[PDB]
Amino acid sequence: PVYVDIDADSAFLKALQRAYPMFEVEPRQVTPNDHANARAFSHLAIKLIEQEIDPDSTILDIGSAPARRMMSDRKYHCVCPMRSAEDPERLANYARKLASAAGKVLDRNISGKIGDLQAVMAVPDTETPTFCLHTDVSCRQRADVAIYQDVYAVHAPTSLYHQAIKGVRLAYWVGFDTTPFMYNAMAGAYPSYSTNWADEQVLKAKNIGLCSTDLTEGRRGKLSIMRGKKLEPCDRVLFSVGSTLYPESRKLLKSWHLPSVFHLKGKLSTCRCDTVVSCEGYVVKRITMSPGLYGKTTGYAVTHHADGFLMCKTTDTVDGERVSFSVCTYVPATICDQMTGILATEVTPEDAQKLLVGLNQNTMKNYMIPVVAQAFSKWAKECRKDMEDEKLLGVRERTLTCCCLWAFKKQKTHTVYKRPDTQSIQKVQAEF
Amino acid sequence: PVYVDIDADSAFLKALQRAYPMFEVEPRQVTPNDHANARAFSHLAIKLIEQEIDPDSTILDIGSAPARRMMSDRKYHCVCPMRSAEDPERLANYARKLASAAGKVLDRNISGKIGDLQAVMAVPDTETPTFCLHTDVSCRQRADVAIYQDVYAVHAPTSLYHQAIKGVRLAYWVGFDTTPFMYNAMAGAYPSYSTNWADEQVLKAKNIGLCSTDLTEGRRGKLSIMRGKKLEPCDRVLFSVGSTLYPESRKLLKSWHLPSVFHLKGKLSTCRCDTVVSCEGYVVKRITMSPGLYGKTTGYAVTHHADGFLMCKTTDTVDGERVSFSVCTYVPATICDQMTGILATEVTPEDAQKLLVGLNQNTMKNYMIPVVAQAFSKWAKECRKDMEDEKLLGVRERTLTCCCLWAFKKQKTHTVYKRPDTQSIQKVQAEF
Amino acid sequence: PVYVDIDADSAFLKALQRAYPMFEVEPRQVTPNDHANARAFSHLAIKLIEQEIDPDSTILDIGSAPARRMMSDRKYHCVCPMRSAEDPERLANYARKLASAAGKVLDRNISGKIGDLQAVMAVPDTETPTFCLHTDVSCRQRADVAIYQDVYAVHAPTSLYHQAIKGVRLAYWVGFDTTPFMYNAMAGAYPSYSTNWADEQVLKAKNIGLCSTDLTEGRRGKLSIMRGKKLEPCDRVLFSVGSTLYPESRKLLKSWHLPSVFHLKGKLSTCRCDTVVSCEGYVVKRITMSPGLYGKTTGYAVTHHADGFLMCKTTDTVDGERVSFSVCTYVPATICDQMTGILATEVTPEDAQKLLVGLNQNTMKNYMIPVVAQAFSKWAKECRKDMEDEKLLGVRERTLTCCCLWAFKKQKTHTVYKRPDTQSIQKVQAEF
Ligand SMILES: C[S@@+](CC[C@H](N)C(=O)[O-])C[C@H]1O[C@@H](n2cnc3c(N)ncnc32)[C@H](O)[C@@H]1O
Ligand SMILES: C[S@@+](CC[C@H](N)C(=O)[O-])C[C@H]1O[C@@H](n2cnc3c(N)ncnc32)[C@H](O)[C@@H]1O
Ligand SMILES: C[S@@+](CC[C@H](N)C(=O)[O-])C[C@H]1O[C@@H](n2cnc3c(N)ncnc32)[C@H](O)[C@@H]1O
Ligand SMILES: [Zn+2]
Ligand SMILES: [Zn+2]
Ligand SMILES: [Zn+2]
């Protein structure tokens, strides 16, 4: 009987129950959290991890908040490298809770957790069995299972290797789906979790999920020192999960988009990465490690789309300058199935938006209805073009460019639309 | 009373109950598996195999996961050649299970399986009665029945001969239907199992089940070193069963499309291959083995279509380059029977898609709906052409090409549509 | 109380009950057999044969599987020539079953059947009372009744004479209706049994029951060594009953289309052939023997059509080459009676197909609806021409071709449509 701090009549509830069929999910709202869905998913993911693994095993959780691991009889190595700015306050709250139940609870090893804390504030390199202050690439504990809950700011292969050489055979990564970042989107949204994200180059946009601009009359533009001439995604992006900000990096996010099979080649030598939980943009990936190189890797990563996924071209204004960039999002499967019949023809963005609103009135958040409509209007258009320019079966028409090279014409692809029950396949680096 | 890890209200349930009338299939969902239908079908296939064969017989299963064979009183030779990269993790889980029930269960010969495991990790050539680490062409155990559960990456005649010389009289192959690869399709889908497969040449496509492309403006194409000038399916294909990747080969897949009667001719010398279970793209084939050469072989293989099967030409964009290739899929029999009345005429693909959507709103997955529409729109067109160009009865009009040869005009065949209650007959190699 | 391994709600059930009024047919599905109707008909045919004949008589069954004849107190001479490739496997299964009830059942003479088996695998010419390994024209057993269940690959007069000189007075042939093959059809279908059959020259066709072709762009045809110039049925045909292949010969199949009265003239010298069971393409014919020559023969064979029978010209593509050939099938009597009103006029194949589908939506299989429509569209057309070109009563207009010969004009006959309650009369050879 798992309890979730969400509304008793929230639409996400059902989806959550579909994501965790082995648990009886019951709502109990005690906080008007702006991102309660994320916390509920994280709670059920942790409960699933505890259920699925060995009860007698030390559990190290990378970059974790020690306050959340309370009331858990399982041994936890709450790794707190003290790197981020939020960590001192998390430790303060954890110490407050640890000092508030000295003679209240005894089965949760709190009596030894007090000693562990007193030890770690004596010598900075104090590797207590249950708590330490080091990064994941420097901790010396030798446990069996690793946990990365909402940990995106770290290189996945390096950390996985560092725990693999540390005896960790199982790793769990609970976090946002990394498929949008393998598509190189300038901005995107997880509407089911009230989450938005955007590259720093479009944080001053107008009509995206995470942006803020100013009223202007259409004056002369900035005498920019840099010409620009190109708007391409940069490494630094901003995540707004409710009203909370996280600065993330595209390289580190893509590092966690591990293929199904990959190799770890360092001092010690195959590994697997499978998506065991996937709900409306939040995923739980079960990585498992095994010493010795066995088999061979294709370097291919697969994402299965229960709901529709879109990455489309859209025109906005950044600081008042009209530009076009890519925006990604998720659309519920019911909406995608109801849109199949209409999308057989060329539909204008306005009619598509009106039909989408009619199907909504809310299954999907209205704030991203327009762009999706445009996406569909592009998709149904492009497919129609593929109807008109029917090529011969198995013939490529390439022109010899007066040299030893061959060139072809690339069509206009404005929308990438992964329908429900489809899969995105992306070539990724293996054999780290 | 067989229990299936599927939803309690899933549409596939009924089809599953229609595939195993001997059993009482009851749903019990404990995992949100992206490919639960595949595992349910495999489970019932194993149960059917166990019911239909001799209880007193050592049962060797080729390339099997030893964890699934637990709680089975029948003797199992779990052959684990340690070739793929997922196998060490399977052995780790199997050893965990074998060490977690030492004093718990005693009727499953686990006490002896522990000794077998400790034997196999002592000498690499330890052929224990219940476990060994060798390929199917090198193991020396002499049992009576062979099982190939989801084993596609092996040569069927070679493995069948190697087990026939080992005394194996019965072989079972549970896996995806191999008819699409005898048709040489570039890509295909088993929608009832959320499965999408594609040739490596078209993994960067736009609107197929297994693909992922990027947004482009229509720039100059790649200055390719190879001219191309032909798009034909290659040996390497990728399977996505839910969110799991499998690199398969066309030759080994076609090797398992055995004819009804074929001969094994080596050191020792008829064989039969029949499809005993067939459900919406997943088949269980019962190969029966017999020493000596008896009768004669036609070299013909037969596939019966309970549901409609389609392999049609479709135009997509691979890496932004517009090409045309073949895509195959299955369509429910109810849909095919409802489409029969209108397909007497020429119907545009848009009208076909709208009629398909009206008949769907879901019997079939919507992401396959458009292309099937195209297929039907092509098929109904081509049939109409055969109506217009009525030839004479038993006359072939071939022109003498000013030589001792004869030539004829080939018509445009863009769609192969095997309706329900039809059969595909393909000439394959016999007498290996 | 006969039990049939068919669905409890199958539409064939009623027809089966109409074909065996003396039995109580009850469904009991224990296998998802692709050709369960054929096996149910064979079971009831065998049981009807057993009921209708002398309980105290040795019953030799030609080319039979010995596993089927189990649980039958009647003495059986299961003749197994070992000619086909399926015989080692059926005998292996039979030995398994005989060895699995050595202390279970004792009223089925199994204790003596074990001795008979041990005898036949000692000397190859061991003619045991109940089992032997010889062809029907070499076995020396002298019994009273012969049974040919699904035995098409043998010459009817030769085998019938060979068992007539062996004292067999009664013979039963349970198999497929041979009327389509006396009409010399290139392809055909028994839809009620999911059965198709095609000549080897049209196995690469496009839109028939048993065919499989490939997508082509309409390129240059094969530089054939043979000119062709004629497409006529050949001796070798392929039968697909569900998903099982049988290579049959037209000569041996037509051999069993025996007339009502025929003579056997050899060393010993009338015989009768009557169709005692007929159901939707499956026939049980009762042949009765009498020594000596009595009466005289007309050489005429009669087939009574309870349901409509069609053989019509249709245009398809064999290996992409557009040709026209004959296709035969059966149509339910209700459909034919509903077809009578509108066939008084000329009806386009499209309208005929639409009205046929309206009458169907399934009484008849949809996959053969179009061609039948074409057939009807031709038939109602040709009849109309006979109405327009009204000749005189008893006058034959024939031109003297400047010689002692006379010639007439032959009309275009594209469809033969034997309506229900009609008979096909064919002149066949007698006095073998
Ligand atoms: C989201 S915050 C902590 C919340 C945590 N994900 C949870 O749900 O319990 C991410 C944390 O990762 C830690 N971190 C930063 N860099 C790290 C690294 N290189 N290795 C391990 N942890 C790190 C930071 O201290 C930061 O507090
Ligand atoms: C799908 S995985 C195992 C799962 C298995 N099909 C099951 O359901 O239990 C296929 C396995 O076949 C094994 N294999 C690969 N090549 C083989 C070969 N040549 N002979 C026998 N097994 C092989 C690999 O070790 C791989 O783990
Ligand atoms: C349809 S299969 C047997 C199944 C059998 N009719 C039944 O329903 O039980 C055809 C069989 O005819 C047998 N056969 C082939 N040639 C024969 C011959 N010349 N005389 C008698 N039987 C023959 C073969 O052994 C083969 O098994
Ligand atoms: Zn530590
Ligand atoms: Zn072995
Ligand atoms: Zn005999």
Numbering used by the authors:
A (entry chain G), B (entry chain E), C (entry chain C): 3 to 271, 273 to 364, 377 to 447
What do the study authors state?
NsP1 is the membrane anchor for the complex, forming dodecameric pores that associate monotopically with the membrane in the necks of the spherules to gate their entrance. Enzymatically, nsP1 also has a role in addition of cap0 structures to the 5′ end of the positive-sense viral RNAs. NsP1 possesses both N′7 methyltransferase and guanylyltransferase activity and reverses the order of these reactions. Each nsP1 protomer is built around a methyltransferase fold common to SAM-dependent methyltransferases with additional insertions (membrane binding and oligomerisation (MBO) loops 1 and 2) and extensions (ring aperture membrane binding oligomerisation (RAMBO) domain) that contribute to pore formation, oligomerization, and membrane binding.
Common to other N7-SAM dependent methyltransferases (N7 MTases), the SAM ligand binds in a pocket near the switch point of the Rossmann fold in the capping domain. In comparison with the apo form of nsP1, neighboring helices αB and C are very poorly defined and overall local resolution for this region is worse compared to the apo and other bound states. The purine base is bound in the anti-conformation to the ribose, where the 2′ and 3′ hydroxyl groups of the ribose form H-bonds to the side chains of D89 of helix αB. The correlation between the presence of SAM in the active site and the disordering of helixes αC and αB suggests that binding of the SAM alone also induces significant destabilization of part of the nsP1 capping domain.
